[model samples]
Target: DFTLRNARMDDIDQIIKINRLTLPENYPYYFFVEHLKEYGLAFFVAIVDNSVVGYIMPRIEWGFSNIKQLPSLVRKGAVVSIAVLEEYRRKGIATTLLEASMKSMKNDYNAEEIYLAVRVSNYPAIALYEKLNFKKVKVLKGYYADGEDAYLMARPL
Candidate 1:
C-alpha cells in the first residue's frame, strides 16, 4: 500500500528522481523547489515502503477559457507534470496523486478548470486523461524538445 499526501521540501530530490526515471521530459531541481514553495498544496506525492513512487505537480493560472464561446479569462489549474515509477504502473497510484492535487487546486486555489498537455504519441496517458474527462481542445505543433506534437486537454472542475 502507498500513502498519498502533500509534498514536503525534503521530498523534492526523490520526486525529481522519479520524474527522471519515468519520463523523458525533465526539469531543473530548482523548478521542483519553486513549485513546492509556491504551490505545495497542489504538489502531491505517493510513498511506498518509505520511498517516493509517484508525484503530481499542478499550478494555478489565470488564462483564457479553453472552451468554445467562453471568451473570458479565468482561474484554472495546469497540471505541469505527473509521473509514476514503471514498476508501479497500473496500480492506481497516479490516480490518487492526481485526485489529491486536483482537490487542492479547487479548494485551495479556487480553480474553475484544469488542463494538461500530452504528447500526441502518448496513447496511455491520453487515454488516462480522457478517462478523467479532459477533452482534447487543440493540437500544438512542435510542442516538445524533440519536435513532437501535443494535445491540449482541458476539463471543467
Candidate 2:
C-alpha cells in the first residue's frame, strides 16, 4: 500500500532526487522549499515502504485564462513538477498524485483551473492528462531547454 499525503519540508530532497531521475527540468532547492512553504496543501507525495515513489508539486498564481486568454487575474494552479519512479509507472500512481493535488488546489486554494506543460513527444503523459479531462490548449515552441516543443494542457476544476 502507498500513502498519498501532503508534502513536508523533509520530503524536498527525495522529491528533487526523483525529479532529476524522471524529468529534464530541474530546479534549485530553494524553489522546492518556497513552493512547499507557500502552497503546502497542493503538493503531494506517494510513499511506499517509507520511501517516496512519486510526487506532484503545484503552484498557485494569478494568470491569464487558459481558455479565453482574457486579461483577467484568476487564481490558477500550475503543476510545477510531477514524476514517478520508472518502475512505478503505469500503475495509476501518477493519476492519484495528480488528482490529490488538483483537489487541494480547488478545494483549499479556490483555484478555478490547473495547467501543466508536457513535452510534445511524451504521448503517454499527454494521454494521461487527456484522460483526466485536461485539454491541449496551446503549443509552446522551444518550451524546454533542449529546444523541444511542449503542449500546454489545462483543465477546469
Candidate 3:
C-alpha cells in the first residue's frame, strides 16, 4: 500500500525526520519550508498510511550539461536530498520516487539532465543510480561535511 505524491507544506516535518534519521547530512526546519515555497515539489514523497517514508527533493537550475563534451549552459535538475527509511529500503520505493522526479524535472522544469551527489562509500545507492542510467561525471573531493569523497553522477533527461 505505497503511494507517491508531490510534497505538501504539511509533509515538511515528516520529510525532515526521514532525512535526519537516514543520512549523515541533514538540514534544519526552515530550509524545508523555504524549499517547499521556492522550488515546491519539484519534490516527491513516498507514503503508506499517511506517513512519509521516502523523499526526493530536487531543484531546477541553469548549468553546464553533465554529459556534453562541449560546455553549453542548460536547464538542469539537481537532487538536493533523497532517502527512504531503513525498514522501507529496497522495495522499489526509492527507484519509483526517482522516476517521478525524472519525469517532473524534464516535463515541468525543462531540465535537460539530472544530477546528484552520493558519498563514494554508498555502494548500493551508486548501484541504483547506475541501474537508472546515471554515470559518474566528477569526483568531488571531500564533498560531505564529514570529509567523505562524493561521486557527482548524472544522466540526460
Candidate 4:
C-alpha cells in the first residue's frame, strides 16, 4: 500500500509528523528542509492506504575531520530518523523505506560508506545495522543526553 519516492518540499510536514512519533527530540522545520534541499538528501516514504506510515532520511557528508591533506572521500549516510506508525509496526514498512533509501544513496549519491549511532540499549537498531553488514566500530561513553552510551556502527560500500 506504500509508494517509494524522493521527498519534495511539500513532504516536510508529513516527515515532521512521522519524526515526532519516533524520536524523543524532533528536528526543526528549517533543519529538515536544509537536509532535503541543500545536500541533495534522499528520503523514502512508506505510504499505505494513501497515508505516510513511515519514512527515512539519508545524507552525505565530506571532509568530516580537520585533516585536509588526506581528505576522506566518504559517502556518509545516516538514517536521520526512520519509523512506522504504531499500528503499522512489524509490517515491513520500516524495512522497505530503509531499503529504498539505501539504494538511492548508493546509485544516486555514489555513496561508499554508511554510518549511524545506536544507543547501547537499542537492541533492535543494533540488530538491523548488523543485518545490513554494519559492524561495531567504536563506543562513545555518555554519548546520549540521558548519559547512555552509544555504539558507533559503520558499513563500507
Candidate 5:
C-alpha cells in the first residue's frame, strides 16, 4: 500500500519526522524547504496509508565532473539525504524513491552526473549506491558530526 510522488510543501513536517525518527542527520528545517523550492522537481516522498513513509532530497549544482577524466565543469545533482521509516524498511520503497529523484535529475535537470556522500559504515546504503552504479571516488574524513568518515560516491548520467 505504498506509492511515490513529487513532494508538496505541506509534506515537510511528515518528511522531517521521518528524518528525525530514522536518521542521525539533523538538517535544518529551512534547508529542506529551500531545497524543495529550488529543486522540487527532483524531491519526492513515498506515501503509505495516507502518510509520508519515506523521502529523497537532492540538489542540482554546477561542479567538476566526478567521473570525467578531464577537469571540466558540468551540471550535477547531489543526493543531499534520503530516509524511510523503520516499519517500511526492506520493501524496496527507498529504491523507488531514489529512482524517482534520479529520473528527474537526469531528465528534467539535464544533470551530467549524480553524486552522494554516505557513512563508511552504512553498508546497506553503500550497497544500494553501488548497485545503482555509483562508484566511490574519495573518502571524506570526518564527514559526519560524530567523527565517522564518508565515501563520496558518484555516477555519470
Candidate 6:
C-alpha cells in the first residue's frame, strides 16, 4: 500500500500518533525527537496511501558491562521501540519495517547485530522477530515498568 522512506521532522507527528495509541507512556516529544538525533538512531515509518500506519525506532549505544558482558558500548544497534496501528497489523507491515530497519543498520550504520526486549506477554511480536532470525538471549524481570517480564532478544546481522 505504501513504500519505505527516510523519516523527516514532519513525520514525527504521525509517528507520535501511532506511539500514543500503542503504548501507555509515550516519551516526551522533545525527548524522542532528540533521540532521533543520536549517533546511530534509526527511525522508520509504515505508510498506507500516503498516511502513516506504523513505525520503528531503534538506537545504538555502547553496551554496558552489566548486560551481555559486552566489553564496549560500541557493540550494536537495538530496536527500542516498534509498533503498528492495531488496524494495520498482521499484513506484513511490521516485517517490512523490521527488515528495512535491520538493513539500514547493517548497510548504513555497519551494525553487527540488532537487539530488542519484548514483553513476555507479547508472544506474537516475539514470533515475528524469530521469523527474522532473532533468538532469545535472556530474560529480565519486570523490564516493563508495568511489571511484565521481558525477553531479551537479538539477531546478528
Q: Candidate 1 — worst ten consecutive residues by lDDT sum?
A: 64-73
Off by over 4 Å in 4: 39-41, 63-72
Q: Write the per-residue lDDT of candidate 2 for residues 1-157, one digit (tens) a residue.
A: 7788999989889999999998889999999999999999989999999999999999999888896667768889999999999988888999999999999999999999899999999998999999999999999999999999999999898
| Residue lDDT tens for model 6, 15-39 | 8888899976487788667757773
Candidate 2 ranges beyond 4 A from true positions: none
The residue pairs that clash in candidate 1, if any, are none
Model 1, residue 135: distance off in Å is 0.7
Please give, for residues 11-128, the per-residue lDDT of candidate 3 as tens digits: 9999988998999788889888777776675789999998999998888888788789656688889988999999988799989999998898888878889999999999999999
Q: Give candidate 5's whole-model lDDT.
A: 0.92
User: In model 4, how large is the Cα lDDT of residue 22?
Assistant: 77
- Give candidate 5 regions above 4 Å deviation: none
lDDT on C-alpha atoms for all candidate structures: 0.90, 0.93, 0.89, 0.73, 0.92, 0.79
Give candidate 3 misplaced runs (Cα > 4 Å): none
Candidate 3 collision pairs: none
Candidate 6: regions farther than 4 A off: 39-41, 64-74
lDDT of 1 by residue, 1-157 (tens): 9888889988989998988887889999999998888888899999898898899998888898886557778998999999999989899887888888888999999998899999999999998888888899999999999999999999888
lDDT of 4 by residue, 51-129 (tens): 7777777777763422123445545667666777788876667777777877777778877667777898988768777
Which residue pairs does candidate 6 place in steric collision? Answer: 62-73, 63-73
Residue 48 alpha-carbon offset, candidate 6, angstroms: 1.4
Instruction: Put down candidate 5 lDDT per residue, 1-157, tens digits, no spaces.
Output: 7998999999999999889997899798999999999999999999987899999999999988888776668999999999988888889988898889999999999998999999999999998889889899999999999999999999988
